[PDB]
């Protein structure tokens, strides 16, 4: 769903965002 695939993107986009976290 459209609503959804937002979400879906959170993953790609806390992807490097955590990578920083470590």
């Given at each position: 769903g459209v609503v ?19």
């Amino acid at each position: 769903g459209v609503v959804d695939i937002l979400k879906g993107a959170a993953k790609d986009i806390a992807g490097h965002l955590a990578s920083k976290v470590m």
